């Protein structure tokens, strides 16, 4: 794409915003930035001679671009957004310029929760077949910055917000990998709109991977010859149970016995199905992608185990930002003693009912905070505690703690009511752990 001599305005001075001034910039073409935020966490970082506008969107400067670049956390719906979009000015996102550039086939992952996951075992798979991979998008690394014109494969954790802006993606294989609710504060015609979002990822798409046991990640009009699926029961990449051992399966073939692996639960070995299919479809080779399953350890804020000691378990799962990944924690979780699970943050307008069903019984504590602490505090009142903050909170458990129990910290909300990023959340869950949970 050609961009000299164009007014270019970027929307939003976070990772994404300082990408895009650093993509432009380099192209000899010096955009112009703004943010709804006064203080953005951004502004300091930006280049001197960046003309800047904070605590509002600038009317002025949006109807007379040419290009409006919209980070992912900044609505289309916005008003002034919606007006320049009325008025025939083009709006994309980061990823949207990425593809635009990217010399190298794509493979695309969305889904409300294992995206990073399976995003992170396909790049494994790659780097296991000796491919030179660039591994970024909603993971946490700017896509463009992986431009790159040695890589020989990309792979792309996409979220639903980058997806509305993206029109120019054809992977080579994509997947949603489940749909359950996340984002309605930003999606005000509901799951079905969130959906038609990651519905994009599969336009163009030569492979497209599908959950056989999630209808909602069936392609816009419908399964077709395009389509690979992954299940628990059935599918083309499928598990089977025999007498205590799991297996994954492609096609009427056992291709890895999961001891092998070192993530457990059946979730993350749909993931695996999902990573191998991914794979297969980018041409990788089968007997590496399978060495790179049984080599991955995990990623760091995903039912991380931060420590062991006296018999309990502190358990920093900050990732969890939306009542499916919470689920996944609390199904099928096997605790000596009482758990004492900590919830809380900005929800998102999430209902938070379907974890009811998972905190009775005897042996369950909660702790709430943040934004919305009240409201999960209310899914079992005469078991929780509600404080405002994470701190407060773990050192009000901490003295109950006793062995056999666990600590979770699984919040299922966002992060960024208290919290630079959910990592900074895991971060001071893990420092705090150590401090009251060890000698
Ligand atoms: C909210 C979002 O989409 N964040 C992703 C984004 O990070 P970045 O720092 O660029 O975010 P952003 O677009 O500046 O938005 C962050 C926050 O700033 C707020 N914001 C942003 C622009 C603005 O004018 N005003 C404003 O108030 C947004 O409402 C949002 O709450 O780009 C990064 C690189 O692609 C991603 O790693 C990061 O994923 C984070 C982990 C995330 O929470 N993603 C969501 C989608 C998720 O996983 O659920
Ligand atoms: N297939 C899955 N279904 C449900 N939860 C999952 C799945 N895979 C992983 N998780 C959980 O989801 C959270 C995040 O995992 P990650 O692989 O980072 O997914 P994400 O899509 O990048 N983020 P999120 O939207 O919070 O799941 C963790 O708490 C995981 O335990
Ligand atoms: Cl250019
Ligand atoms: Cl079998
Ligand atoms: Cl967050
Ligand atoms: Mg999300």
Request: glycine residues 10%.
């Amino acid at each position: 794409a050609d961009y000299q001599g164009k007014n270019v305005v970027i929307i939003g001075l976070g990772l994404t915003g300082l990408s895009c001034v650093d993509f432009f910039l380099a192209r000899g073409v010096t955009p112009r930035v703004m943010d709804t935020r006064m203080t953005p966490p951004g502004l300091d970082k930006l280049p001197e001679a960046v003309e800047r506008h904070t605590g509002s969107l600038n009317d002025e400067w949006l109807m007379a671009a040419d290009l409006i670049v919209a980070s992912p956390g900044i609505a289309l719906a916005h008003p002034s957004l919606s007006a320049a979009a009325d008025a025939g000015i083009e709006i994309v996102g980061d990823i949207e310029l990425f593809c635009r550039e990217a010399q190298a086939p794509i493979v695309a992952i969305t889904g409300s929760n294992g995206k990073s996951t399976v995003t992170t075992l396909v790049g494994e798979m790659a780097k296991a077949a000796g491919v030179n991979v660039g591994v970024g998008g909603n993971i946490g690394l700017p896509a463009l910055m992986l431009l790159d014109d040695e890589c020989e494969l990309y792979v792309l954790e996409l979220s639903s917000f980058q997806l509305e802006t993206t029109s120019s993606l054809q992977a080579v294989a994509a997947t949603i990998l489940n749909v359950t609710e996340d984002h309605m504060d930003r999606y005000p015609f509901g799951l079905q709109q969130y959906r038609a979002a990651k519905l994009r990822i599969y336009e163009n798409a030569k492979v497209c991977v599908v959950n056989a046991d999630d209808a909602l990640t069936m392609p816009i009009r419908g399964a077709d010859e395009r389509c690979v699926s992954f299940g628990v029961n059935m599918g083309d990449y499928h598990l089977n149970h025999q007498q205590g051992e799991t297996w994954l399966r492609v096609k009427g073939e056992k291709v890895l016995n999961v001891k092998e692996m070192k993530l457990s639960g059946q979730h993350n070995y749909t993931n695996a199905l999902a990573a191998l299919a991914l794979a297969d479809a980018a041409g990788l080779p089968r007997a590496s992608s399978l060495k790179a399953l049984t080599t991955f350890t995990g990623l760091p804020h995903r039912f991380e185990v931060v420590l062991e000691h006296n018999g309990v378990r502190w358990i920093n799962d900050s990732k969890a930002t939306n009542v499916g990944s919470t689920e996944a924690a609390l199904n099928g979780l096997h605790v000596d003693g009482t758990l004492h699970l900590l919830l809380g943050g900005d929800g998102k307008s999430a209902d938070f009912s379907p974890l009811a069903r998972y905190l009775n019984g005897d042996n369950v504590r909660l702790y709430c905070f943040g934004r919305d602490g009240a409201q999960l505090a209310a899914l079992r009142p005469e078991v929780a505690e509600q404080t405002e903050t994470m701190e407060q909170a773990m050192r009000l458990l901490a003295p109950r703690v006793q062995p056999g129990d666990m600590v979770l910290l699984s919040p299922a909300c966002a992060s960024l009511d208290q919290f630079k990023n959910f990592e900074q959340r895991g971060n001071e869950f893990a420092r705090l752990a150590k401090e009251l949970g060890g000698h």
